[PDB]
């Protein structure tokens, strides 16, 4: 997103 | 917190 | 997997 | 512990 | 950064 | 490296 993410809904997804 | 945060004061200590 | 383990094939999937 | 290893038992914590 | 950081420009540099 | 390895030597580093 820069920055590395870690998007949390369990199963984390790391996204730039 | 959603995201992983990873919160640092060392020791880290990841919390959604 | 314990460790939290960022897999990577791009997007990256963190998983226990 | 080199690297940043995410201990999981949650809440996560980040060692070298 | 407190927390830990990770700037994305790849390789990513992880900074408090 | 896959995973995403976090190489620490601090400022981390990290690599597939």
Same mark, same amino acid.
């Given at each position: 997103?820069?920055?590395?993410? %870690? %998007?949390?809904?369990?199963?984390?997804?790391?996204?730039?």
């Amino acid at each position: 997103v820069a920055k590395l993410v %870690f %998007f949390a809904d369990a199963a984390i997804i790391g996204l730039m």
